Each structure stands twice: as C-alpha cells, then as structure tokens.
Amino acid sequence: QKRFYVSIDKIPEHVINAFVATEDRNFWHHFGIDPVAIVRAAIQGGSTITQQLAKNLFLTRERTLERKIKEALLAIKIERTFDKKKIMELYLNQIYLGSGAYGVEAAAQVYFGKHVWELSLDEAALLAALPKAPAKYNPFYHPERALQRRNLVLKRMLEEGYITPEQYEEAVNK
Amino acid sequence: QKRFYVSIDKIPEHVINAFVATEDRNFWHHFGIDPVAIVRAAIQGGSTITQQLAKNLFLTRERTLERKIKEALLAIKIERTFDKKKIMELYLNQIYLGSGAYGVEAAAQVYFGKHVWELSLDEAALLAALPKAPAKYNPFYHPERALQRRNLVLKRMLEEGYITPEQYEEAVNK
Numbered sequence A, B: 001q002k003r004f005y006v007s008i009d010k011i012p013e014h015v016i017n018a019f020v021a022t023e024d025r026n027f028w029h030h031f032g033i034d035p036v037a038i039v040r041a042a043i044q045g046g047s048t049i050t051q052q053l054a055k056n057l058f059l060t061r062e063r064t065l066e067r068k069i070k071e072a073l074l075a076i077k078i079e080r081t082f083d084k085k086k087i088m089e090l091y092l093n094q095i096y097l098g099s100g101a102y103g104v105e106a107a108a109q110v111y112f113g114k115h116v117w118e119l120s121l122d123e124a125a126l127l128a129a130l131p132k133a134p135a136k137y138n139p140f141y142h143p144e145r146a147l148q149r150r151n152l153v154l155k156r157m158l159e160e161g162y163i164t165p166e167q168y169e170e171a172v173n174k
C-alpha cells in the first residue's frame, strides 16, 4: 500500500481543490486548528486536513477526548515544521479511500484505471467524497450515495469559486 | 524557519550517506525501530532516524519513558505509511542543526553560503555531526570539537563503504 507516492506538482488543481472545499475550506490559512470552523460546526465535523493527517499517524485508532487533543497538538507542530503544499501532499498520499486504496494515485487506478494527473473534474470530486466514510460511499457497491456525495462535492467547489457554472453543470451530469 | 525545503532527489549522496552512517546505519532496512541497535547500544544511542523524526513532531519536548514509547509507536506507523526515501526527506528538512538553521539547505547556507547540492564531502560530514548536540558541536564557536566530530563522521562513512580511502584522506585534511 505504501507504494504509489506522487508529488503535489503532479496532482491536478481540481483534485486538490475538491479535497479542500469538502474537508477544510480554510486549509490554506489556519495554523493546524480552526476555531471558526469548530464553532460554526458546533451548530458537520470541524477537524482540519492537518488534524486528519495527524490522526492517521497513530498506530491504534481510538477516539477518546484524550487523543483528540494529542492530535491537535501534533497538528500544530506539523504546521510549524512543514509548509501548506507539503502537508497537502503527505495527506493526499496517505488518505484511505476504500477498496484497499491509500492515496489519490492508487485510488485513481482502482476507480478509474488511470493516473491521478489524467483525472477529469467529475472524477476528482468522487475521490474527495470518500474520506468521510469510504465503505459507506464506495462507488463499487453504493453507487447511489457515491454519486450523491460526488455532486455535493462539486457544489462545494462551485461555492468556493474553484470551478465555473459551466463546469459544474457538465460534471454533475457525468 | 519553515521556509527552505528541498526534495531528496536534489540532496547529494554524500549528505544522505553521512547522516545514515552517523545516526542510523541500518536505516534502509529496519521498520522504524532497531532492536539489534538497541541491544548493541545498551552496552551510544539506539534511536533510529524515524524515531528522531517522530520525536520532533511533538510540541512540548519532555523525555519521559512514557513518551519514548509514544514516539516508537508513531515511528512504526510512519514507516507503514511512507517509504524510506520520503522519511529521509522529511527528516533532512526538519532537523535542527544549530544557529537557527532547520533543515540541510538552510544549514548549508548558514555554514557554507551555498546550496546543499553544492556541498563537498567534508562539508556534508560537518552537518551530520550536529544532530547529537548542535550547540555543543557548533563550528561558529566550538570549531575544535566540531572538526573532531566531523572527522569521526568521515570515519563512519569510510567504515560503511560510502567513501573510498582516497576520499577519506582528502576530506579529514580539509
């Protein structure tokens, strides 16, 4: 699994943008933790990309308040150590996307039989829909809600200004 | 400080080899933790490069048995997530090397006024001597033991087969 790394410079804007719009809209500006996100979400998760990266660096996967804090501290240090593009790179190569695919390149091959850099806008959006719950939104056997969440990602991209109305209309119909 | 990243492919073999020979000779083969190293060292530290990377990912810097273990668990997971060349890359860009220099490129500029890829064998060895204690072996004000430890690094490189006898003799005299 730990074989399929791809540098950020070879990952299309649509893929990077789809993940940002869906999981952490303020990714490029916060310091590893986002209060405005937590509050507005306290009303929907509030964890940043950095926090997810940190969470997946642990060996055992428990969800106690105790380690949520440890994950937040780790996230802040990482943010102090590596830049945004690097954190995004590590994250996009480690993320479990279902069907035994860890990372965007492996996911691209498993779900579309191609390299991440050959992905279309609608294909990029499908990958960004999986992190929430890979097995729950897996196209290979829950194509109904996979398509629904994909269109929801495209909607988030449209709202954030990452794609045009024209592009949106074409993608949701693919 | 978090501004001066350089990909592994632009870091000279001598630099990578100098760090491996000095800090973790079996780096390329272990799984994040090295028993043979710990035992043989129990007789000299026994922590791997991966463990040092993990140690520096924490925010606060305490040295209790409690977190040494947490660092070992983190190291094992990292090893499962990213490959050797990537772990080496992250490590060589994060390592504090004294005089406010974090990473090999920043160190190269501060100590030699040049890019890491323009470093000679004797210059690479000096950087590998700092991690043990940057302020204790700093050339800028403890050139005596900096030179001593540099020559000790070159000796380790010679022993590991990373440099030739000819190269060794030339470097220790620089």
Ligand SMILES: CC(=O)N[C@H]1[C@H](O[C@H]2[C@H](O)[C@@H](NC(C)=O)[C@H](O[C@H]3[C@@H](OP(=O)(O)OC[C@@H](OC/C=C(/C)CCC=C(C)C)C(=O)O)O[C@H](C(N)=O)[C@@](C)(O)[C@@H]3OC(N)=O)O[C@@H]2CO[C@@H]2O[C@H](CO)[C@@H](O)[C@H](O)[C@H]2O)O[C@H](C)[C@@H](O[C@@H]2O[C@H](C(N)=O)[C@H](O)[C@H](O)[C@H]2O)[C@@H]1O
Pocket: A023, A044, A045, A046, A047, A052, A055, A056, A063, A064, A065, A066, A068, A095, A096, A131, A132, A133, A134, A135, A136
């Ligand atoms: C169902 C599914 O899709 N599972 C796969 C999983 O998919 C993960 C998926 O990998 C994981 N994503 C990342 C990036 O880590 C995802 O996280 C979500 C999940 O996170 P999590 O459960 O860790 O709780 C975190 C929460 O702290 C909460 C704690 C607090 C103390 C609150 C904090 C307080 C505040 C005020 C903030 C928080 O504040 O965010 O919920 C968040 C939330 N509610 O806000 C979330 C929506 O923001 C979050 O999404 C992201 N992107 O971070 O959760 C899903 C599944 O959650 C499942 O929820 C079920 C009931 O709700 C539980 O029973 C499950 O145990 C739990 O896993 O990814 C794993 C890597 C897979 O593991 C593999 O499974 C394979 C297989 N069979 O498919 C093989 O067995 C293989 O060997 C094995 O390694 C799993 O099979």
Ligand SMILES: CC(=O)N[C@H]1[C@H](O[C@H]2[C@H](O)[C@@H](NC(C)=O)[C@H](O[C@H]3[C@@H](OP(=O)(O)OC[C@@H](OC/C=C(/C)CCC=C(C)C)C(=O)O)O[C@H](C(N)=O)[C@@](C)(O)[C@@H]3OC(N)=O)O[C@@H]2CO[C@@H]2O[C@H](CO)[C@@H](O)[C@H](O)[C@H]2O)O[C@H](C)[C@@H](O[C@@H]2O[C@H](C(N)=O)[C@H](O)[C@H](O)[C@H]2O)[C@@H]1O
Pocket: B023, B044, B045, B046, B047, B052, B055, B056, B063, B064, B065, B066, B068, B095, B096, B131, B132, B133, B134, B135, B136
């Ligand atoms: C003296 C010096 O050079 N200090 C700078 C430091 O330099 C670090 C340096 O950054 C650090 N290297 C890395 C990669 O993290 C270095 O680690 C060594 C050190 O590690 P550590 O103290 O964390 O103990 C780890 C130990 O767990 C031990 C625990 C157990 C429970 C045992 C486990 C049991 C087993 C059976 C294994 C183990 O098993 O390895 O000793 C190891 C050992 N004895 O085996 C070692 C030789 O293997 C190890 O070397 C490496 N490469 O991992 O230690 C030196 C200094 O150690 C100092 O030792 C003194 C007395 O011996 C203590 O009083 C000091 O507190 C301690 O730091 O790096 C920091 C980043 C600098 O911080 C900056 O300072 C600046 C400044 N003023 O210069 C500014 O203030 C700035 O704002 C601030 O951020 C520091 O200024």
